Amino acid sequence: QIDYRDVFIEFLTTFKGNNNQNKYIERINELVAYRKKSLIIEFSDVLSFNENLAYEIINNTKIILPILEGALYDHILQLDPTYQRDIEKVHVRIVGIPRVIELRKIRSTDIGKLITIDGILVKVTPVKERIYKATYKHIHPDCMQEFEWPEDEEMPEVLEMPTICPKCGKPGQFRLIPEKTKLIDWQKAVIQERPEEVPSGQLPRQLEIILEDDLVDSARPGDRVKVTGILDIKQDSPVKRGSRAVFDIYMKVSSIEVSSEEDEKKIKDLAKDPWIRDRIISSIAPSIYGHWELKEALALALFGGVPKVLEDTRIRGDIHILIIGDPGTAKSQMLQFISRVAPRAVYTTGKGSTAAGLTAAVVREKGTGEYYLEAGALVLADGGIAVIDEIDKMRDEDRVAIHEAMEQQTVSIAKAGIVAKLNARAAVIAAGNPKFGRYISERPVSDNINLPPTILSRFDLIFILKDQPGEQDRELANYILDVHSGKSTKNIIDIDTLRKYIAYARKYVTPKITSEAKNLITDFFVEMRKKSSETPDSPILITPRQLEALIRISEAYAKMALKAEVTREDAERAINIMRLFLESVGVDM
Amino acid sequence: QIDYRDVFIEFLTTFKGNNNQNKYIERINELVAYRKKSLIIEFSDVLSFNENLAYEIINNTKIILPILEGALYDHILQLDPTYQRDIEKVHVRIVGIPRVIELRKIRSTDIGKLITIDGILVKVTPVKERIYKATYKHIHPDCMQEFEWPEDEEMPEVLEMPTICPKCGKPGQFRLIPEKTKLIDWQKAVIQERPEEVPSGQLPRQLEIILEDDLVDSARPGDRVKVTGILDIKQDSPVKRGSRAVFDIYMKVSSIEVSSEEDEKKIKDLAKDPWIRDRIISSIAPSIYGHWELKEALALALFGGVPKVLEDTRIRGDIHILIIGDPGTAKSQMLQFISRVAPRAVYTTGKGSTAAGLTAAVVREKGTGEYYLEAGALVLADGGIAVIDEIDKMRDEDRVAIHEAMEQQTVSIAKAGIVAKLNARAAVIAAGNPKFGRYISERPVSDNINLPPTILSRFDLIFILKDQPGEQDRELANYILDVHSGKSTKNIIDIDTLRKYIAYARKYVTPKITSEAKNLITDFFVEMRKKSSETPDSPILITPRQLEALIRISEAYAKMALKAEVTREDAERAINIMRLFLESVGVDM
DNA sequence: TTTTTTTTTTT
Ligand SMILES: [Mg+2]
Ligand SMILES: [Mg+2]
Ligand SMILES: [Zn+2]
Ligand SMILES: [Zn+2]
């Protein structure tokens, strides 16, 4: 019952952070600068500053937030009166609630309490409007009266029309007045439980969440998020009894976090090592022995090149990798690692996917009867990585649907009266087997690969993996048994901080091509084209795409070391890795 | 008539277990310590203690369960006052009801009586909430009053709204108040009668059951369960009568069991015998003469290896077996035995299965038009065994759908806007015929098997069965006729005991590899690779998967004797069985 | 009719 508004104000005005800069007065300082009407407060900080204040938020959230938010509004007005007439209400979002519940473990005892759920966002609806205070007109020739229907109370989830006119006490018909009605932004989304916590032999569960006001459009499908709010039962058709007094539950979101400064200097410290590139390569799939050239190639695809956008066209900046190898060469294990270390990645298989599922699907809503688009795997992976294992098992009639997405990075649909064009700027990493399961060295490369030259030309690097039992079997066997015994390689960058390093590099580093790098690349391309003319039977063609592959690889090498430009050393590395690619496919220079 | 609360409390505190250790007193504090709020009792023990109490439970169940619930709750409160304010109600569940009725024999006379049904779980719905006590507000400008609608009575299965406001006696509008409403967990499941119970020439029948409160998520689809509770008629759509006074029936589950200390002593006693391994093998398919190497291989697949989960990857722990043989070699009979003895197994046929049915199917829900996922055979067999008879009859373009699930143990779907990943950690045992029905010795091994090298490398062991008539025909004929004469082989572990032994071993034994075993395995693997490279024509490739097969087989041998370590003896057995596999496919060693 | 994934008969 003690007044916490004074406690809140002194907590906000007077607080010391780890950096010792009064973290919580700069947030409100920027609150009036951009007028974002939302403040983020950590539960750990409020608990340390005042244990009693933190508890009251947890258990009395229903009737402490409006008072707490109202106190903050007055303080903001005192700081700057100009905030008036621009923002009427300010929301306070609390994160870091210790009450974390698994999606499958929610029971009746958790209804009405502030909890946190970690999951995957799978579906988002367009932003709509919700009525919380309506205005009605009594259509009865004596009344012609206006009144806000829900008195001293907001409109509930179910819309209700007055039965007795409050202005005259008589029944009749009432007409809604949209211009005098108060609205609020409304959005609906679906959260799916992570695959880690799904029990054996069961399908993942889903929960419906509601985003309102400034929380709308705060995430995109496929994101991993943490949501905090209050559970409640869902009402859809209360008018129709139809027996079955059984209801589903939904969650009213109060705050959302999508999965800091101490990371910046940690990343900067790593980039200062002259051997940072070797450390990153050694950290790719530590459980796999050998395959150093493949690990280097996979590292390049994670960083990628620099896309170019011009007045009349744009140039692809992503790097595509294709691996062909004998069974048991750990191709799938490395692809699994890539899907985990990448900040955004989608893992698909050749057999378990279709053309519609990879790019876009036209689906007809049975209710309304109209068609609309559904995002495919490549569209969802925009700005990230797409992994397509067992690509050779795809039907050729179905695999050609990704030809334009691989180069033009767009998806074109002309179906059922829908003409659309969606961005699909995603890198593609694929693996497969030769025509006869294992590579036959007694036959040409033409019949071993069994892939059209059109798709082969789209891959920046192609590596043919041969399982040759030689003298390295003992070393390989010892390494595998050590892995099974729990022994782990040391002096490697762990997956968590490696993910942060890639995300930072892809966002703030844009290397530039220097004059000396241009000469090395130009000379190499001329020799590459000249050497290819010797053997025209090979299904590998040296097209101008290969020249742009060298440019992209050179930029990726510079991006690994966080350099701002491409020097001759990065160009030399790009030529070296390209040489190994050519040797594998049988082109020797 | 009389109150048995004193008897019930006395029975709980005075009953004697098998060792007269009061097998019921230590359950009470376990209930208190973990706040499980659910206690189970055995009907045989209650009948053995007091005959009168057992009859009252078996007959007056609906008017004695709340009475015993209140008495037990009071005994808990005095034992520990902290139990209050955390659990407001404790349920007591009775099992072992003598009233057992087949699913097909239920008649109107059994309605309203405590019965028990044994069947197979097929469908389970997500957990929902059911209102048992509502709160309404009369929306009439004079009332604004809140009240609990169902007075001194639980809310019926049909949601009924008050017609006359009790607080004012007038009709009008009533608004539900979710905050003051009381809810209870609610789940719906479907049970099917056992295949051995279905009459000739008819489809199996199904029954709908309801699980509430702590009984939710008590089992997974495909389980064998025994459900006890009260039958009742189902009221689903009472809005419009439409004549049809006919109703279905459903069951309110009171206690559910799936599929112990005395068994543990029996299991541990068996493991003391030095020849337990040979004794177990002799118990595999006792009606089949010969095929000793096959029975040993099948025994290993039942136990499996030790899966390894690391911070960056996971390693398969299951063992896959492939059998190719001439018709009439008892391949199907042995596979049928594995289904009966395995704690969890799924039996499929190559011709009677599809790619979508094996892994996962995307289906359009008719009510809403939205696509959703359906679990396939491999997903339903997670943590168990999947049997695929007549694998050679599958279309090759359709058989490749299980390549991912057999090594990575995952199912990936990218179809119709759905991207998902599912766990399929199951062991695969497959059988089939050679290319020409019977094995042809003139032709090589490559054209006889007629399978791609990719699928062959996935199998830990491959055995080729040749039906060669010889001097052993008389022994085989005598054995078969003895089986038809009713004579049974003795000194074999019964199937029920063997199933318990395997389930215990797979849950509590995790063997570890010693230094001595590592040296033996490494030497043998190197020897395979050298020998394989000498004859680069066989359809069997010695990939690194073969090395991991040796580790998995060695762990299975140790797990078969409940050993915590993999000594050198288990390594020799693993090497020996692998030698026979190589000789079968014509690879000499 | 229309696009989609599925099992099925029949174009
Ligand atoms: Mg693979
Ligand atoms: Mg058969
Ligand atoms: Zn009026
Ligand atoms: Zn009233």
Domain boundaries, chain B: 4-95, 129-183, 263-585
Q: Distances from the Cα of B241 to the Cαs of A244, A583, B235, B236, in angstroms?
A: 16, 79, 11, 11
Question: DSSP labels for B232-292?
Answer: EEE----S---S----EEEEEEEEEEE--HHHHHHHHHHHTSTTHHHHHHHTSSTTS-S-H
Whether nucleic acid strand C comes within 7 Å of the CB of A356, the answer is yes
Q: Distances from the Cα of A128 to the Cαs of A38, A124, A184, A211, in angstroms?
A: 20, 12, 8, 10
Q: Do A163 and B172 touch (CB under 8 A)?
A: yes
Cα–Cα distance measured from residue A106 to residue A249, given in angstroms and rounded to the nearest whole number: 10
Cα–Cα distance measured from residue A350 to residue A331, given in angstroms and rounded to the nearest whole number: 14
Name B435's Cβ contacts closer than 8 Å, sequence gap at least 6. Answer: B392, B447, B448, B449, B450
Locate all alpha helices (DSSP H) within A342-390, ordered by sequence.
355-358, 377-380
Whether nucleic acid strand C comes within 7 Å of the CB of A357, the answer is yes
Parallel, antiparallel or unpaired: strands B565-566 and B512-513: parallel
**C1' (C11) to CA (B360) span, angstroms:** 29
Residue A396, beta-bridge partner list: none
Task: Compute the Cα dihedral for B364, B367, B369, B372 and give only its sign.
Answer: negative
In three-state secondary structure terms, A129 is: strand
Whether nucleic acid strand C comes within 7 Å of the CB of B60, the answer is no
Nucleotides of C under 7 A from a protein CB: 2-7
Q: Report the 10 Å Cβ neighbour count for B439.
A: 20
Cβ-contact B344, B506 below 8 angstroms: no
Q: Do B313 and A242 touch (CB under 8 A)?
A: no
Cα–Cα distance measured from residue A202 to residue B420, given in angstroms and rounded to the nearest whole number: 13
Cβ-contact B317, B305 below 8 angstroms: yes
Q: Which fold has domain B129-183?
A: Rubrerythrin, domain 2 (2.20.28)
Q: Which residues surround ligand 3, an ion (CB under 5 A)?
A: A 138, 143, 165, 167-168
Cβ-contact A249, A233 below 8 angstroms: yes
Q: Which CATH architecture has domain A4-95?
A: 2-Layer Sandwich (3.30)
Size of interface A-B (CB pairs under 8 A): 253
* Residue A339: closest CA among A389, A374, A373, A393: A389
Question: How far is B239 from chain A, CA to nearest CA, in Å?
Answer: 6
Residue A324, beta-bridge partner list: A432, A464
Flag whether A383 is marked binding: no
Cα–Cα distance measured from residue B94 to residue B46, given in angstroms and rounded to the nearest whole number: 10
- For an interface test with A, the pick among B159, B185, B215, B458 (most A C-beta atoms closer than 10 Å) comes out as B159
Structure tokens at A205: 């569960």
Whether nucleic acid strand C comes within 7 Å of the CB of B127, the answer is no
Cα–Cα distance measured from residue A111 to residue A233, given in angstroms and rounded to the nearest whole number: 8
- What phi, psi does A167 have (nearest 5°)? -85, -25
Whether nucleic acid strand C comes within 7 Å of the CB of A170, the answer is no
B167 touches chain A (CB under 8 A): no
Residue A230, beta-bridge partner list: A114, A252
Cα–Cα distance measured from residue A544 to residue A303, given in angstroms and rounded to the nearest whole number: 22
Nearest ligand for residue A172 CA: 3
Whether nucleic acid strand C comes within 7 Å of the CB of B415, the answer is yes
Cα–Cα distance measured from residue B400 to residue B413, given in angstroms and rounded to the nearest whole number: 14
Cα–Cα distance measured from residue A318 to residue A556, given in angstroms and rounded to the nearest whole number: 10
Closest nt to A417 (CA→C1')? C2
A352 touches chain B (CB under 8 A): yes
Cα–Cα distance measured from residue A505 to residue A498, given in angstroms and rounded to the nearest whole number: 11
Cα–Cα distance measured from residue B219 to residue B122, given in angstroms and rounded to the nearest whole number: 10
Structure tokens at A175: 């007409």
Residue at minimum CA to C1' distance from nucleotide C1? A416
Question: How far is A371 from chain B, CA to nearest CA, in Å?
Answer: 12
Structure tokens at B68: 């015993």
Q: Do B159 and A332 touch (CB under 8 A)?
A: no
DSSP letter, residue B553? H
Flag whether A326 is marked binding: yes
Q: Distances from the Cα of A125 to the Cαs of A185, A189, A210, in angstroms?
A: 12, 6, 10
The H-or-E segment that residue A187 falls in is: strand A182-192
Question: How far is A26 from chain B, CA to nearest CA, in Å?
Answer: 38
Name B1's Cβ contacts closer than 8 Å, sequence gap at least 6. Answer: none
* Residue B99: closest CA among B279, B251, B320, B240: B251
Q: Do B131 and A244 touch (CB under 8 A)?
A: no
Query: How many Å lie between the centroid of ligand 1 and the Cα of residue B122?
Result: 33
B540 touches chain A (CB under 8 A): no
Which amino acid would we find at residue B234? K
Cα–Cα distance measured from residue A405 to residue A388, given in angstroms and rounded to the nearest whole number: 14
Query: How many Å lie between the centroid of ligand 3 and the Cα of residue A175?
Result: 11
This structure's resolution (Å) is 2.3
What's the count of helices (H) and strands (E) in chain A, helices before strands?
20, 24
Cα–Cα distance measured from residue A442 to residue A449, given in angstroms and rounded to the nearest whole number: 14
* Residue B423: closest CA among A206, A345, A197, A122: A197
Q: What is the CATH number of domain B263-585?
A: 3.40.50.300
Structure tokens at B464: 């080729």
Cβ-contact B161, B174 below 8 angstroms: yes
Name B180's Cβ contacts closer than 8 Å, sequence gap at least 6. Answer: B135, B146, B148
Cα–Cα distance measured from residue B303 to residue B559, given in angstroms and rounded to the nearest whole number: 7
Flag whether A452 is marked binding: no
Structure tokens at A504: 């930072």
Whether nucleic acid strand C comes within 7 Å of the CB of B220, the answer is no
**C1' (C3) to CA (A424) span, angstroms:** 21
A483 touches chain B (CB under 8 A): yes
- What phi, psi does A88 have (nearest 5°)? -85, -40
Q: Report the 10 Å Cβ neighbour count for A544.
A: 10
Cβ-contact B514, B567 below 8 angstroms: yes
Question: How far is A107 from chain B, CA to nearest CA, in Å?
Answer: 7
How buried is B278 (Cβ within 10 angstroms: 0-12 exposed, 13-18 middle, 19+ buried)? exposed
Cα–Cα distance measured from residue A298 to residue A291, given in angstroms and rounded to the nearest whole number: 11
A324-351 burial by CB neighbour count: b if 16+ within 10 A, else e? Answer: bbbbbbbbbbbbbbbbebbbbbbbbbbb
Experimental technique used? cryo-EM
Cα–Cα distance measured from residue A291 to residue A282, given in angstroms and rounded to the nearest whole number: 11
Chain B environment of A422 (Cβ under 8 Å): none
Cα–Cα distance measured from residue B28 to residue B83, given in angstroms and rounded to the nearest whole number: 12
Residue A90 half-sphere exposure, CB side, CA atoms within 13 Å? Answer: 26
* Residue A301: closest CA among A462, A160, A469: A462
Q: Distances from the Cα of A371 to the Cαs of A124, A409, B369, in angstroms?
A: 17, 24, 12
Whether nucleic acid strand C comes within 7 Å of the CB of B361, the answer is yes
Locate all alpha helices (DSSP H) within A205-259, ordered by sequence.
none
Closest nt to A413 (CA→C1')? C3
- For an interface test with A, the pick among B183, B184, B395, B419 (most A C-beta atoms closer than 10 Å) comes out as B419
Cα–Cα distance measured from residue A325 to residue A585, given in angstroms and rounded to the nearest whole number: 12
Residue A419, beta-bridge partner list: A414
Cα–Cα distance measured from residue A331 to residue B462, given in angstroms and rounded to the nearest whole number: 24
B437 touches chain A (CB under 8 A): no
Q: Do B414 and A108 touch (CB under 8 A)?
A: no
Whether nucleic acid strand C comes within 7 Å of the CB of A364, the answer is yes
Cβ-contact A202, B126 below 8 angstroms: no
Structure tokens at A429: 């990493």
**C1' (C4) to CA (B356) span, angstroms:** 15
* Residue B227: closest CA among B47, B92, B37, B95: B95
Q: Report the 10 Å Cβ neighbour count for B457.
A: 22
Report the chain B residue with the minimal C-alpha distance to residue A155. B175
**C1' (C1) to CA (A416) span, angstroms:** 10
**C1' (C2) to CA (A123) span, angstroms:** 24
B226 touches chain A (CB under 8 A): no
Cβ-contact B320, B301 below 8 angstroms: yes
Question: How far is B264 from chain A, CA to nearest CA, in Å?
Answer: 25
DSSP letter, residue A545? H
Q: Report the 10 Å Cβ neighbour count for B303.
A: 22
Residue B42 half-sphere exposure, CB side, CA atoms within 13 Å? Answer: 10
Name B462's Cβ contacts closer than 8 Å, sequence gap at least 6. Answer: B321, B322, B323, B324, B456, B540, B581, B584, B585
Report the chain B residue with the minimal C-alpha distance to residue A434. B454
Whether nucleic acid strand C comes within 7 Å of the CB of B373, the answer is no
* Residue B229: closest CA among B251, B208, B250: B251
Compare CB distances from A203 to B239, B373, B414 and report the shortest one's residue.
B373
- What phi, psi does A433 have (nearest 5°)? -115, 155
User: Which positions 398-417 on chain A have a beta carbon less than 7 angstroms from any atom of strand C?
Assistant: 415-416
Structure tokens at A445: 């490369």
Q: Do A363 and B416 touch (CB under 8 A)?
A: yes
Which amino acid would we find at residue B62? K
B352-379 burial by CB neighbour count: b if 16+ within 10 A, else e? Answer: ebebbebbbbbeeeeeeeebebebbbbb
* Residue B130: closest CA among B159, B153, B152, B87: B159
DSSP letter, residue B100? B
How buried is A182 (Cβ within 10 angstroms: 0-12 exposed, 13-18 middle, 19+ buried)? middle
Cβ-contact B406, B428 below 8 angstroms: yes
Q: Secondary structure of chain B: what % helix, strand, coil (to 5)?
A: 40, 25, 40
Q: Distances from the Cα of A86 to the Cαs of A32, A80, A133, A183, in angstroms?
A: 10, 12, 20, 16
A346 touches chain B (CB under 8 A): yes
